[PDB]
Design a protein around this ligand. Structure first.
Ligand SMILES: Cc1cc2nc3c(=O)[nH]c(=O)nc-3n(C[C@H](O)[C@H](O)[C@H](O)COP(=O)(O)O)c2cc1C
Ligand code: SF4
Ligand code: SF4
Ligand code: SF4
Ligand code: SF4
Ligand code: SF4
Ligand code: SF4
Ligand code: SF4
Ligand code: FES
Ligand code: FES
Ligand code: FES
Ligand SMILES: [Zn+2]
Lengths: 630, 151, 571
């Protein structure tokens, strides 16, 4: 491909490929994210593309390139990432018809091309219907899930091909970099700190002070590095951002390297995700042939280079301290501080380590200025935070909201309420890195300061909703088991206390528990929080401590009364007999090895809980089904 | 030995980066599966690395392994979202009917179990996927059909 | 120099900027406990037991916290004590409590810290560590008592540069291992014993063979000769509450006599044998001018390091045996025919402070000259076993005719003292005269530097000499030699840092400046002797004129020489 010259040539090519999109009339696009590519996404693509090759359509080409730059296409097939609303899929959208089609399982793939493309009509039996209201939604913006979301960070996703560089350039991006090379760096840092931008993932520290401190360190060769790896098994944002549009991440890298003065950078992505790393390799190679990456970028003299390092699993690897060790080629054991990572990090060179949500808002801040970005949200902490909603809600998936709104409309209005008309119990924020919030504190605005006084931090941002069906002791034990399996084992507190807490919780949930275990849990939680080394051990006992602090009634029910209120712990099950529904078959006596049920034939039986082994075979073996687990 | 020819041209192509060790130990598993018990100290003594350090690297990350892997690997998700919809009992049903525990494989025919968490289909029930045939809504009685076509 | 003003526990402190808050509070008459910290290692922060409380109110580690202006700290607050107590309960919850069977009994630091912090009732009872004990040779590894402090890995990484062992697994089940749990003999270990010296628990110990010594003694037809090392005379007293560096030669000779040993000897006689043989070899190599530089063979660990890592230097190594094996050959060849005993019926026991000697004793190529070996700790345990009070013994001398010695063989327990024992003999043999006055002592080969270099002028002829203590400095000097910057003539290498006085068999000490005291003790022992020259010994000359008639003879080549074979297995 041709190499890019200075800014005026970039604008000329901008106009030349802006012509390409307005030399088209009809476009069709499919959700190419991992949500659609699990129940059939390319299958729907081939169920429809062969129809276009047998319906007298010539201009069918999908991948736009320089050879096909001057082809006026009557129909154009697009491949876009996570458009949203991944609860109901696969997602289909065509323009400029203006439809929103869900549930496109290949049973009527021929009707969409015959009706919407030719007759310009809209099929109503397959459109989205809300079970609560029954209304039919035809426009994307008319949908309640898209009604109050702010599409700001995700402006270009859902309408830009991640595999084509010419698609992102033709939208209006890569102009912030062109404005940046023609101006100084100190005012860039001043605009960054003035905008109120601070770290999205993890800590929440202001990025301006970190960038300025990296600037003030006089070193020959320092590093810029990316921690995009959602270790916690709660949400999906690392999936969405890169597979939607990776070029904005590269532009943010270029802005940061021009600002602080970096010449080579690294991106840490997990190798277990093949599609995302493949898209990054394609984007890096296409940009390298494009000429924005390398030496003498656009005739200025600034030099830059990117490497993509594939990780190897473990959740305790992106601590900002074990990641430099992992890239170096050693074990991911965190080291002590001070010295911090801003003074001597990767190979004893200065480093800056930002999550890839902070490197995404940089082009927007450069383009619009800090005055516009600070205008959204509470002035104490600006910006917007992305969330992944999951659990027992009608609509699940990705969401982006103006930070500062009340949680009630976030969980009920956006989520469409709780599924199966059940009752809501609790919300977990941040996954393992956060505590519980019950129904009583649902009217709290979402932000840093007020949530800090509630004991819970948003962390990555995964929001999971749990109903009355489950028992909280099992949920806390699940978190503790994950932390136990996922530690590293270097300092005594985390390594021993997590195992001890897991054993204590397993003892309690098995019905063998005794009095005074709650005080031991609180003491262990305090010690592990105080005396750990890295953040994982400092944050590990938070779910258990929060569950004790808010749900002591469940623990007292499990310890003394030996009954589980939600009936979710099988180790405390209680099988009971209906006297009227019993016909005295006696199969429960026969199939149970200990035979704790004893009675006369053709008569109701009585269960002795003292000698019952609670195997559950009594209800499932006698065909009458009069025995119920209550 | 034919093993000492496929490990030779990989230390010359993707080994020009100064400090790369994780990539080399990953492509070996990618191209052969079983990480051999003999190749490790060979690649150690080859370039500059003691065998102890790469043995420590190999046993830390859960992706790497030192036991035989079957042809077909089954994952049971077990993330925090796919845990509330009764995903604890499906692994119990697996171990009740097939025999092997989690992390232990029946090396005879083709089967292996693994516990990778929260794949990209999150929002579509507990997703117990076969190697390339990921499922949707699953029930402890549905397990049987997995043994039907995949056998 | 810039000083920092602070307060610690309500007391004003003046200390230089850069010291930690634990190492700068030791001079206030206060000491805070810690297990992961040693004076020879970089801080690691794995114990989390050395925590203190600053002004803000959060617990901060001390072994890796630089001090700055304006902090108030307290090391006796109830919160800190409670945290320490809970951390030690967490440690002892998963420790197999067979303190009767532990070799590290009454010296384990975990036991002392469990006594100090007043632990009385372990509330956390659960799953313990259950691993399997394997055999490795002279190093006994039991991964049931490991606390994963990481001292052994760091001392095999930061100092030795051998990289023999490393961490393995993760979480609660992590441990210390060689690759694939192979025995230490087949791994890259060189048996220096530094990992044994620093382990604060009973995980790493010695394979003890007091039993075989006991049926050797109990056999009515077996005659037992026991030999003592030069570096044992300065460190045994620490086992009995004395200040380190006290000369205890007569007391330990009396103790060995009362232990049932038939004959007791010192190895300084065989040491002077090695000195005169090595001087003859060096004169021969100077006259031919071939195979330079030439390396000593006094350290088995150095020989193993060459045979495993540098097999190309085998032709450049001296073929002289170690003094232990030479004394064994002398005892089983000459002394046996003089007394009139069969060769199979003589039992030779050695008391040496090194750990590689335990492995070196069982090489198939040495024809089993010595039968069993000991270290100083086992000797002290035997002395306390028989009930002998070490304080109130009476001084008595060695046996005959291999008991007396010279001053040249009493400085082998110091880095540099071997070549310093050979330069006097080389001066005497080449010049023809003997040094007088202070010219006997060479001040350029004394100290504790990593690499010591000297240019010695003898009768207008200059020779370049070098000393390397520690295998890391040895690797650095080998790199310098292979670079070809300068040419040497005679190179000494000792594997342990600081010479044989810091071997793995020496008793455990907590004082940070033990090396200076041991060097002072060795030098005082050397200066308190009438004869200071190896050539002036009588019985060495008698042995040559009765059995060999010439150094470097065919009989000496048959009995006092060995050959080395490469161990680098091709992969
Ligand atoms: C247990 C643990 C988990 C972490 N998980 C993440 C993560 O999932 N994503 C992430 O970007 N950073 C994670 N981090 C921390 C990284 O160091 C992070 O990139 C850094 O704190 C971000 O700084 P910033 O907000 O100024 O950009 C984690 C740290 C710990 C200790
Ligand atoms: S607190 Fe836990 S995860 Fe963090 S370094 Fe210590 S053992 Fe590892
Ligand atoms: S299963 Fe029903 S009918 Fe049979 S014994 Fe029990 S209660 Fe009676
Ligand atoms: S599980 Fe309990 S109630 Fe049911 S048959 Fe067995 S002993 Fe009786
Ligand atoms: S290592 Fe210490 S605490 Fe453990 S058994 Fe031995 S003497 Fe007792
Ligand atoms: S004996 Fe020396 S080389 Fe061997 S493991 Fe211990 S410290 Fe390392
Ligand atoms: S073997 Fe000893 S020195 Fe090594 S980690 Fe275990 S306790 Fe520490
Ligand atoms: S220096 Fe001395 S104590 Fe150390 S290994 Fe060599 S001979 Fe043994
Ligand atoms: S983009 Fe595929 S499910 Fe949403
Ligand atoms: S947590 Fe199971 S797929 Fe997301
Ligand atoms: S032992 Fe001192 S900080 Fe860990
Ligand atoms: Zn319960």
């Amino acid at each position: 491909m041709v190499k890019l010259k200075s800014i005026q040539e970039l604008e000329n090519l901008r106009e030349k490929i802006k012509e390409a999109k307005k030399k088209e009339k009809i476009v069709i696009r499919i959700c190419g994210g991992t949500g659609c590519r699990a129940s059939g996404s390319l299958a729907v693509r081939d169920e429809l593309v062969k129809v276009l090759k047998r319906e007298g359509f010539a201009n069918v080409d999908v991948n736009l390139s320089s050879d096909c730059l001057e082809n006026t296409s009557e129909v154009h097939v697009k491949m876009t990432g996570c458009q949203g609303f991944c609860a109901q899929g696969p997602l289909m959208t065509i323009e400029p018809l203006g439809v929103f089609y869900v549930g496109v399982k290949p049973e009527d793939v021929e009707e969409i091309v015959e009706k919407s493309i030719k007759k310009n009509e809209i099929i109503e039996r397959l459109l989205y219907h809300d079970p609560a209201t029954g209304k039919t939604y035809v426009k994307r913006d008319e949908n309640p899930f898209y009604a109050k979301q702010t599409r700001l960070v995700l402006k270009h996703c859902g309408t830009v091909d991640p595999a084509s560089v010419y698609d992102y350039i033709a939208e209006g991006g890569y102009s912030a970099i062109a404005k940046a090379l023609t101006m100084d760096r100190k005012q860039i840092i001043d605009e960054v700190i003035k905008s109120g931008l601070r770290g999205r993932g993890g800590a929440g520290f202001p990025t301006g002070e970190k960038w300025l401190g990296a600037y003030k360190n006089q070193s020959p060769k320092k590093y810029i590095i990316c921690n995009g790896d959602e270790g916690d098994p709660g949400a999906f944002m690392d999936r969405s951002v890169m597979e939607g549009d990776p070029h904005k991440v590269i532009e943010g890298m270029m802005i940061g390297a021009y600002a602080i003065g970096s010449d080579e950078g690294y991106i840490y992505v997990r190798a277990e995700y093949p599609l995302a790393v493949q898209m990054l390799r394609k984007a890096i190679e296409e940009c390298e042939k494009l000429g924005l990456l390398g030496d003498n970028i656009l005739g200025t003299g600034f030099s830059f280079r990117l490497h993509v390092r594939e990780g190897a699993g473990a959740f305790v690897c992106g601590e900002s301290t074990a990641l430099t060790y992992s890239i170096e080629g050693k074990r991911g054991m965190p080291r002590v501080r001070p010295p911090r990572t801003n003074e001597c990090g990767l190979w004893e060179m200065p480093t800056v380590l930002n999550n890839v949500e902070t490197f995404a808002c940089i082009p927007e801040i450069i383009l619009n200025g800090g005055e516009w970005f600070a205008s959204i949200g509470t002035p104490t902490s600006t910006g917007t935070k992305i969330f992944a909603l999951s659990g027992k809600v009608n609509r699940t998936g990705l969401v982006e909201v103006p930070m500062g709104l009340k949680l009630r409309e976030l969980i009920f209005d956006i989520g469409g309420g709780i599924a199966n008309n059940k009752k809501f119990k609790a919300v977990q924020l941040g996954g393992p890195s956060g505590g519980c919030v019950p129904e009583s504190q649902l009217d709290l605005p979402i932000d840093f300061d007020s949530l800090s006084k509630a004991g819970a931090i948003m962390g990555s941002g995964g929001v999971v909703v749990v109903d009355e069906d489950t028992c909280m002791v099992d949920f806390a034990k699940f978190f503790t088991n994950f932390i136990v399996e996922e530690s590293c084992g270097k300092c005594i507190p985390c390594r021993e206390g997590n195992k001890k807490m897991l054993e204590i919780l397993e003892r309690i949930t098995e019905g063998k528990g005794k009095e005074g275990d709650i005080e031991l849990l609180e003491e262990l939680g305090d010690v592990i929080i105080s005396a750990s080394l890295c953040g994982l051990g400092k944050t590990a006992p938070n779910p258990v401590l929060s569950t004790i602090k808010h749900f002591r009634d469940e623990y007292e029910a499990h310890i003394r009364d030996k009954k589980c209120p939600a009936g979710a712990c099988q180790a405390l099950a209680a099988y009971k007999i209906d006297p009227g529904k019993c016909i005295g078959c006696g199969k429960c006596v026969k199939v149970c090895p200990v035979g704790a049920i004893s009675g006369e034939k053709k008569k109701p039986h009585v269960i002795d809980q003292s000698k019952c082994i609670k195997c559950g075979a009594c209800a499932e073996n006698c065909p009458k089904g009069a025995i119920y687990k209550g | 030995d034919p093993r000492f020819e496929k490990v030779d041209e990989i230390l010359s192509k993707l080994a020009n980066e100064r400090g790369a060790l994780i990539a080399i130990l990953q492509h070996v598993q990618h191209e052969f599966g079983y990480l051999p018990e003999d190749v490790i100290f060979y690649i150690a003594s080859k370039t500059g690395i003691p065998a102890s350090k790469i043995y420590g690297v190999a046993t830390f990350y859960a992706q790497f392994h030192l036991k035989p892997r079957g042809k077909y690997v089954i994952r049971v998700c077990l993330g925090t979202a796919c845990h509330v919809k009764g995903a604890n009992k499906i692994l119990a049903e697996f171990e009740k009917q097939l025999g092997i525990k989690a992390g232990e494989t029946t090396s005879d025919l083709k089967f292996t179990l693994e516990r990778v968490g929260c794949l990209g289909a999150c929002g579509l029930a507990p997703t117990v996927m076969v190697n390339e045939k990921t499922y949707g809504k699953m029930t402890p009685e549905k397990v049987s059909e997995v043994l039907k076509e995949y056998s | 120099m810039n000083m920092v003003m602070l307060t610690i526990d309500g007391k004003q402190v003046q200390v230089e900027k850069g010291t930690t808050i634990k190492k700068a509070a030791e001079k206030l008459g206060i000491e805070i406990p810690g297990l992961c910290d040693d004076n020879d290692l970089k801080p690691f922060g794995a114990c989390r037991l050395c925590v203190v409380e600053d002004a803000r109110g959060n617990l901060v580690a001390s072994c890796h916290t630089p001090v700055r202006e304006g902090m108030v700290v307290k090391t006796n607050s109830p919160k800190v004590l409670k945290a320490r107590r809970v951390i030690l309960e967490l440690l002892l919850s998963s420790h197999n409590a067979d303190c009767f069977e532990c070799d590290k009994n009454l010296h384990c630091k975990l036991q002392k810290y469990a006594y100090e912090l007043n632990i009385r009732n372990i509330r956390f009872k659960g799953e313990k560590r259950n691993y399997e004990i394997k055999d490795n040779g002279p190093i006994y590894y039991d991964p049931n008592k490991c606390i994963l402090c990481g001292k052994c890995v760091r001392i095999c990484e930061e100092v030795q540069h051998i990289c023999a062992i490393d961490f393995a697994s993760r979480g609660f089940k992590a441990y210390i291992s060689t690759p694939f749990e192979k025995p230490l003999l087949e791994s890259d270990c060189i048996f220096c014993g530094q990992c044994v010296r620093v382990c604060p628990t009973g995980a790493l110990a010695e394979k003890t063979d007091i039993e075989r010594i006991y049926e050797a003694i109990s056999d009515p037809n077996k005659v037992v000769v026991v030999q003592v090392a030069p570096a044992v005379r300065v460190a045994l007293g620490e086992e009995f509450g004395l200040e380190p560096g006290e000369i205890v030669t007569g007391k330990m000779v009396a103790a060995l006599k009362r232990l049932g040993f038939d004959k007791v000897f010192d190895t300084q006689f065989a040491a002077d044998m090695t000195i005169v043989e090595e001087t003859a070899e060096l004169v021969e190599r100077l006259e031919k001018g071939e195979n330079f530089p030439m390396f000593t063979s006094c350290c088995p660990s150095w020989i193993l390091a060459v045979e495993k890592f540098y097999p190309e230097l085998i032709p450049n190594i001296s073929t002289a045996r170690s003094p232990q094996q030479i004394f064994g050959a002398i005892a089983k060849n000459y002394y046996a025919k003089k007394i009139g005993v069969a060769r199979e019926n003589m039992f030779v026991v050695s008391v040496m402070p090194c750990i590689g000697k335990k492995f070196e004793a069982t090489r198939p190529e040495f024809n089993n000259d010595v039968d069993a070996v000991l270290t100083t700790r086992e000797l002290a345990r035997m002395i306390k076993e028989s009930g002998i009070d070490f304080i109130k013994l009476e001084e008595e001398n060695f046996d005959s005719p291999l008991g007396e010695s010279t001053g040249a063989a009493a400085i082998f327990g110091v880095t540099g003292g071997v070549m310093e024992a050979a330069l006097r003999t080389a001066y005497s043999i080449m010049t023809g005269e003997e040094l007088e006055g202070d010219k006997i002592e060479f001040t350029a080969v004394r100290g504790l530097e990593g690499i010591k270099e000297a240019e010695v002028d003898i009768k207008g002829k200059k020779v370049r000499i070098a000393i390397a203590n520690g295998i890391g400095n040895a690797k650095k000097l080998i790199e310098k030699i292979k670079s070809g910057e300068t040419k040497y003539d005679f190179v000494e290498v000792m594997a342990c840092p600081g010479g044989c006085m810091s071997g793995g068999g020496q008793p455990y000490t907590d004082d940070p400046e033990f090396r200076k005291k041991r060097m002072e003790g060795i030098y005082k022992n050397d200066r308190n002797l009438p004869k200071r020259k190896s050539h002036e010994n009588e019985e060495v000359k008698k042995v040559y004129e009765e059995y060999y008639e010439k150094p470097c003879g065919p009989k000496a080549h048959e009995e006092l020489h060995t050959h080395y074979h490469s161990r680098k297995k091709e992969y």
